[PDB]
């Protein structure tokens, strides 16, 4: 129940692939972040070279947005990509859904690539909101605006204003300082009771409370991390005063770490599972379709 039993035959990608092929594994939760859309032209924060942090969190604090909203709309013009193509990792999460293996994708990302890849609302907890819709900030109005409209205003370089009441129109994201959506808490309440595999991709696990989601799995739920760096290990100091990631100690029993590009790592997993051709065809067919329209 809260007991530590080993379900992977070994702490490797192949271990995880065998486990996923088994009956015990029916219900997968993905946790994802900016690492899964870096190769889609959207920078993360923590990457030395191409990360936003140095190319700083003020521009995403509410109290600074509240005072000065212009710098953020200016940034969003900058980073607003020329076209929206999801990555191999996005489409890997697609295959999961289509094979009825995906219970939920919990995402820190606000880029909508998960929906474009064809994850539905039901499948998706967008824990930091999204640019998909936008709303008026005026509580008496709260008129809802699509991404097509929001883009017209950001690219126009006019601060978006509601056409009914002329209030600021806000993209629908959770800034730092703001409370997460309710549906995040109530989904977590239910999902982590019944998760069979915890798959974690392209996140540093530094933003709370989203990071604490890994400790909500049952203690015998395997957890696979696909990322450029280990993440989610208990800190030696903050731990001093639980359920962090343990890939390495002699007490490792269920946590695996594949370190590299998510696109390669997901492509590797897919191949073990005999989904490689299915993945290539999907990505290629979906990207061509995006190129056509």
């Amino acid at each position: 129940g809260s007991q530590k039993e080993r379900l992977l035959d070994e702490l490797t990608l192949e271990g995880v692939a065998r486990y996923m092929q088994s009956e015990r594994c029916r219900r997968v939760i993905c946790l994802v972040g900016a690492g899964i859309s870096t190769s889609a032209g959207i920078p993360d924060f923590r990457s030395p070279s191409t990360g936003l942090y140095d190319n700083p969190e003020a521009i995403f604090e509410i109290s600074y947005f509240k005072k000065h909203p212009e710098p953020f709309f200016a940034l969003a013009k900058e980073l607003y990509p020329g076209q929206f193509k999801p990555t191999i990792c996005h489409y890997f999460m697609r295959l999961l859904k289509d094979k009825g293996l995906l219970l939920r994708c919990y995402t820190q990302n606000i880029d909508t690539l998960e929906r474009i890849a064809g994850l539905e609302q039901e499948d998706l907890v967008e824990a930091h909101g999204t640019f998909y819709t936008s709303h008026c900030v005026s509580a008496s109005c709260r008129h809802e605006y699509p991404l097509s409209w929001m883009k017209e205003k950001i690219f126009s370089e006019v601060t978006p204003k509601c056409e009914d009441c002329q209030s600021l129109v806000k993209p629908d994201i959770v800034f730092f300082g703001e409370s997460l959506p309710a549906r995040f808490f109530s989904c977590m309440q239910s999902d982590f009771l019944k998760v069979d595999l915890l798959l974690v991709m392209g996140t540093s696990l530094q933003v709370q409370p989203f990071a604490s989601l890994i400790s909500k799995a049952p203690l015998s739920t395997p957890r696979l991390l696909i990322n450029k760096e280990k993440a989610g290990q208990s800190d030696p100091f903050l731990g001093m005063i639980g359920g962090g990631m343990d890939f390495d100690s002699k007490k490792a029993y269920r946590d695996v770490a594949w370190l590299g590009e998510c696109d390669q790592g997901c492509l590797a997993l897919a191949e073990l599972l005999g989904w490689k051709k299915e993945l290539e065809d999907l990505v290629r067919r979906e990207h061509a379709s995006i190129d056509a329209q």
Binding site: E57, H128, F175, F176, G177, E178, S179, Q206, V207, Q208
Partner: peptide
Amino acid sequence: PRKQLA
């Protein structure tokens, strides 16, 4: 809890 780097 609110969003925070931590």
